[PDB]
A and B are shown apart, each in its own frame.
With several copies, the nearest count.
Chain A
Amino acid sequence: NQHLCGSHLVEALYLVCGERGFFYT
């Protein structure tokens, strides 16, 4: 599918970037 919507996006974003953290202003 790769329509990473709903609770996929909270998991798969961590699955690709689980150590840098996310970005904030």
Chain B
Amino acid sequence: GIVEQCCTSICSLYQLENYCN
């Protein structure tokens, strides 16, 4: 699910930090 949240629109540093625990 990380592509359509972070390749289709703009992506934030608070979003992808959830992916690393």
**Interface positions of A (Cβ within 8 A of B):** 2-5, 9, 13, 16-17, 20-23
Q: In the complex the two chains form, is A9's CB within 8 Å of B20's CB?
A: no
| A13 to B20 Cα, complex, angstroms | 8
Does B20 lie within 8 Å of A20, measured CB to CB?
A: yes
27 CB-based A-B contacts, threshold 8 Å: A2-B10, A2-B11, A3-B6, A3-B7, A3-B10, A4-B7, A4-B11, A4-B16, A5-B3, A5-B6, A5-B7, A9-B2, A9-B7, A13-B19, A13-B20, A16-B16, A16-B17, A16-B20, A17-B19, A17-B20, A17-B21, A20-B20, A20-B21, A21-B21, A22-B20, A23-B18, A23-B21
